[PDB]
Symmetry: C2
Subunit: 262 residues, 2 copies
């Protein structure tokens, strides 16, 4: 009868959870959260993610990769990360937060934009070789990211917390890409216009814990995945159980290793 | 869909003074169809009533005097209820229930037998007031589960909500047989006591609450009415049923417990 909730994108290894991660994780189980997809940002926390993956086996699923922001990412940042990913290739659910961030502060220079582009292209190629999906960031770079993903022939893709127009998002739905919705949708008008247009067959749930919570500058936790489910249910004029059943089914399609690893 | 009801919360609390409208707009987006705002002291009755006018049909007001007073805490007095009575009488027709009444037999506040009887008398009068105005009671029962449930039975209370019942399931079963309702706050995911409670508790007797700003998923972290889905999620998993079944039944139970609700929405 009852179905579980999947957090397709979160940062459990973040310094914000160092103090109470186990209490947070036990409470998430009680809050009907069946699986957590833990993503990486830098190579320095890959061991910590793989350690959480072993301690909470079948509940915390790992993702390793180098994020566009580190300062903009460099090829040198990806070089350090490649031997570690290769060592855990069989244990990963996806390539853990890769993408582009064309924010004025981080990437203003054309060289910085190409460095990001190069680091993403290699990780799309790495993912294709290891037969793994990509868990993607695209802040202020929605069309650049989607085009690059199409060009590189990415099959299983998650566009997490899509900070872009619905016309750009429609390019992704046609490309067969998935979109995760964080609980910050209840305070964000941009995320509101997005879900409106987005078909439920292409929607997944995320928190992006410790970020993108219901309140700005207040720590976000994986149990807030129900807030996302509630917002989508009301906006789509359907049952919350329908949202929970379809988004969890979408998570199983997007991440093919999930059904077995759960 | 059906919508979620927060059967017990403190929107008038000083914790919400800065961003209440942002909190309430955010709660609407989070599929919260109704909020039942309760009182603690007469000094915030005007604030609760003004809020219910501003958010008409969404914020449902409850007025009453809580067993604990002050903000160093002390036990309630008959004088505290006397100041309240003229204000409740002025808003009798606009209220959904008598707003957080009950007993608190914590060692710090009601140690003395006289303090325990002062609380008992303040509650008894409010049950009498509620019976006259034909209103339900929204009840507190910290460390006084059986004393509250017996007193309510003795006084012949018809529509009762035992909010965040902190007592044993055997004591709670006395309430279900008496036809009383029990609201569950999102602190259930961190509280073992409330975990054994819902286990035994029939869903036909369960309601949802947050008790905002208190009893959140995290201790010493502000609780907001959108956390009512966390409560619904916990109950669904434990009962091995659909979250929509919990949302539909608890809202239906809220409409039975509060007879003015269907009309006031
Ligand atoms: Ni927190
Ligand atoms: Ni807060
Ligand atoms: Zn991101
Ligand atoms: Zn992220
Ligand atoms: Zn209380
Ligand atoms: Zn209360």
């Amino acid at each position: 009868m009852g179905v579980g909730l999947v957090d397709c994108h979160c940062h459990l290894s973040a310094p914000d959870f160092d103090r109470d991660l186990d209490d947070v994780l036990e409470k998430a189980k009680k809050a009907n959260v069946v699986a957590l997809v833990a993503v990486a940002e830098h190579s320095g926390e890959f061991e910590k993610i793989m350690q959480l993956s072993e301690r909470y086996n079948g509940f915390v699923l790992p993702c390793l990769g180098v994020h566009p922001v580190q300062r903009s990412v460099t090829l040198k940042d990806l070089d350090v990360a490649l031997p570690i990913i290769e060592n855990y290739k069989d244990r990963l659910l996806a390539i853990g937060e890769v993408g582009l961030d064309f924010s004025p502060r981080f990437a203003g220079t054309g060289e910085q934009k190409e460095e990001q582009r190069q680091v993403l292209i290699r990780q799309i190629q790495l993912a294709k070789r290891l037969n793994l999906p990509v868990n993607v960031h695209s802040r202020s770079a929605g069309r650049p990211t989607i085009n690059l993903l199409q060009e590189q022939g990415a099959e299983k893709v998650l566009l997490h917390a899509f900070d872009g127009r619905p016309s750009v998002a429609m390019e992704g739905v046609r490309a067969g890409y998935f979109f995760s919705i964080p609980p910050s949708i209840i305070r964000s008008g941009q995320k509101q216009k997005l879900v409106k247009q987005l078909p439920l067959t292409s929607i997944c749930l995320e928190t992006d814990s410790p970020a993108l919570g219901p309140e700005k500058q207040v720590r976000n936790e994986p149990w807030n995945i129900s807030i996302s489910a509630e917002y989508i249910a009301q906006v789509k004029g359907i049952s919350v159980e329908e949202v929970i059943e379809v988004t969890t089914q979408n998570a199983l399609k997007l991440f093919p290793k999930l059904r077995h690893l759960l």
